[PDB]
Design an enzyme around this catalytic site. Structure first.
Site, short mmCIF file in Angstrom:
data_model
loop_
_atom_site.label_atom_id
_atom_site.label_comp_id
_atom_site.label_asym_id
_atom_site.label_seq_id
_atom_site.Cartn_x
_atom_site.Cartn_y
_atom_site.Cartn_z
CG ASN B 9 -42.37 0.02 -19.67
OD1 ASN B 9 -41.69 0.89 -19.27
ND2 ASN B 9 -43.16 0.20 -21.51
CB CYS B 14 -38.71 -3.54 -19.80
SG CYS B 14 -37.88 -1.89 -21.04
CG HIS B 251 -39.32 -4.81 -24.01
ND1 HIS B 251 -39.56 -4.82 -23.65
CD2 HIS B 251 -40.13 -6.01 -23.56
CE1 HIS B 251 -40.40 -4.59 -22.72
NE2 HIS B 251 -40.57 -5.90 -22.40
CG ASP B 268 -44.05 -7.73 -22.22
OD1 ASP B 268 -43.85 -7.10 -21.67
OD2 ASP B 268 -43.64 -8.83 -23.77
#
Lengths: 75, 326
Positions: B9, B14, B251, B268
């Site tokens: 990130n 994201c 997110h 993630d």
């Protein structure tokens, strides 16, 4: 010329437009009929997001063409 | 731990990382990106940046960076901290790549994977006037409010509407006329990108977090003009791009069963982690955190689209270019 616009509810509204209109003009006309502020509109046509500054003619958008209106989920 | 690597990130990227993993495991697309001629000015070529990210997610054992890719967009570092919509990126990035594939060995790959055709029928109700429009799509916007699941949301999409009042149809020599409009799918592409309309406009943009169920297997023959008894339009769920937060910000993560085998991971950003079907599908139904984009692959084309990719699919010239870059 009359195009179609699919609105955020899926419903189809007609829009009265001219090959000359820029994308800002169309976004302004959608505001006039649907109330969405231009700043939040994103317009999808044949896999392209239309660009402020281009024209409807630049996309071969003619009569009975359907544009798809969406907002933004940012992240 | 998972077999797959995550993506760093940069700060607010994201959206890109979740899109990138999504396209990365569209194997047939990645195969074609590797084959694009970037023999192209370094850190100005979006294809060269896409080959670099794809190569690295396929080879590294540490989280991969996306600095050169945002550079090739024309972006300064500040832009890597502005939050964005994953479907808006997808539209722009695939368009750019599609145009850059023209005139190459892999022209037509993106429309072959992602492009379908709609038809819209218009029938005047008080005069004999019919008309027709066929348009290509690369994704489908599906309404959510008031719909229980994806199936009702296709039913609504194909349902007949009245073009009446301020929305009367301009029927030519007959001037404005009440009419019915109906849409159907002529074809459905091998890779199906669904954008769920989880938004509505207090004068503000409000995210819809209502429960919207989506299945592992999606029969779409009902929404075609003509069904092919050869290749039924049955689709297998491959990816769930999940958005958490509000319209202002939030997110992105994406859940994917890369091989289409029902074995799921979660991506993630830097952390990839195995997960259950229940955690990728039912837990993303909503009702903060929910599915925004769904990727389905046509069952008849799963073998080809998700064909295993190895080092024989990466041209040596690129392997030299990428490694000999320090």
């Amino acid at each position: 010329m009359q195009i179609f616009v699919k609105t955020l509810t899926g419903k189809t509204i007609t829009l009265e437009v001219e090959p000359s209109d820029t994308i800002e003009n169309v976004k302004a006309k959608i505001q006039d009929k649907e109330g969405i502020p231009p700043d939040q509109q994103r317009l999808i046509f044949a896999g392209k997001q239309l660009e402020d500054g281009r024209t409807l003619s630049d996309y071969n958008i003619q009569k009975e063409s359907t544009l798809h209106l969406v907002l933004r989920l940012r992240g | 731990h998972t077999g797959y690597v995550g993506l760093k990130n940069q700060g607010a990227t994201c959206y890109m990382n979740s899109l990138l993993q999504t396209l990365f495991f569209t194997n047939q697309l990645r195969k074609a990106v590797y084959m694009m001629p970037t023999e192209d000015d370094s850190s100005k070529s979006v294809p060269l940046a896409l080959q670099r990210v794809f190569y690295e997610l396929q080879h590294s054992d540490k989280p991969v960076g996306t600095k050169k890719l945002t550079k090739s967009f024309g972006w300064e570092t500040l832009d890597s901290f502005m939050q964005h919509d994953v479907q808006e990126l997808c539209r722009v990035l695939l368009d750019n790549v599609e145009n850059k594939m023209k005139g190459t060995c892999v022209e037509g790959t993106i429309p072959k994977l992602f492009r379908g055709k709609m038809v819209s029928y218009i029938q005047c109700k008080e005069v004999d006037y019919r008309s027709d429009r066929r348009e290509d799509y690369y994704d489908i916007q599906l309404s959510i409010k008031g719909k229980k699941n994806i199936f009702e949301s296709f039913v609504d999409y194909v349902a007949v509407e009245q073009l009446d009042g301020d929305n009367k149809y301009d029927a030519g020599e007959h001037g404005l006329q009440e009419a019915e409009k109906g849409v159907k799918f002529l074809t459905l592409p091998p890779v199906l990108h669904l954008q769920l309309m989880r938004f509505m406009y207090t004068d503000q943009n409000i995210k819809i977090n209502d429960r919207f169920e989506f299945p592992e297997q999606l029969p779409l023959d009902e929404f075609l003009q003509k069904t092919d008894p050869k290749d039924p339009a049955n689709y297998i769920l491959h990816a769930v791009l999940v958005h958490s937060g509000d319209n202002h910000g939030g997110h992105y993560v994406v859940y994917l069963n890369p091989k289409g085998d029902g074995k799921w991971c979660k991506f993630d950003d830097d952390v990839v982690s195995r997960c259950t079907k229940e955690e990728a599908i039912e837990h993303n139904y909503g009702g903060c955190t929910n599915a925004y984009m769904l990727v389905y692959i046509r069952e008849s084309k799963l073998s080809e689209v998700l064909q295993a990719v190895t080092d024989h699919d990466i041209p040596q010239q690129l392997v030299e270019r990428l490694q000999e870059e320090k």
